[PDB]
Symmetry: C2
Subunit: 126 residues, 2 copies
């Protein structure tokens, strides 16, 4: 499973890339919404997407990517109010996990969404 | 979209049934895990599942239903610690929302999972 990490915090993306690679995932990193849209293709199984970023924020990135891709999206951001969470889900995200987050919960939420994607893929191939 | 509500709190299930029917859903209620397994068939689009219940708890209900059904499951329970959340996701739930919860976030999470189910169904039919 290939994960596209989108966040301008280079300390967080380096830490998450190491954590997720140790959990068996292939991780690629984008540091803004424009770079995310450049790297998004059919090889991506899931996006971890921040909101506040320079060049193109995560809400605009989510709206743009949903015009061409149904790729699973988890918002992962310091914008964690109940209003922010509903906004992210309604604009096309599958899940929304505020920062600070628990590493184990993030890994379990990634695994839960990819388990459902795999079930859909098995049925489609059959 | 047809929702199976599983919780022993009759005050909560009556309130949620009214809320969800006003949001356009068809809602059926089970008050324990045994009744949930009796009511679970291919017509159910999503389960809202509690943990602490008499006769059969939600963790055992989730394990049993995952042997025959890939139906989307959201755990909705007062067992809200980070450890409880990871446990629920790892045992087969798609999402996990602790009580007390925000009504709008619950509705958005239901809508997000059913939006993904609809995308899978469209592809499968094509
Ligand atoms: Mg940021
Ligand atoms: Mg209960």
């Amino acid at each position: 499973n290939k994960i596209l990490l989108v966040d301008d915090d280079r300390e967080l993306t380096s830490l998450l890339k190491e954590l997720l690679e140790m959990e068996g995932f292939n991780v690629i990193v984008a540091h803004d919404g424009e770079q995310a849209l450049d790297l998004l293709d059919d090889s991506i199984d899931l996006l971890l997407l921040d909101v506040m970023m320079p060049k193109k924020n995560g809400i605009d990135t989510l709206k743009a990517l949903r015009q061409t891709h149904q790729t699973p999206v988890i918002m992962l951001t310091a914008r964690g109010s109940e209003l922010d969470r509903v906004l992210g889900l309604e604009l096309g995200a599958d899940d929304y996990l505020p920062k600070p987050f628990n590493d184990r919960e993030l890994v379990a939420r990634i695994r839960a969404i990819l388990r459902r994607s795999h079930w859909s893929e098995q049925k489609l191939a059959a």
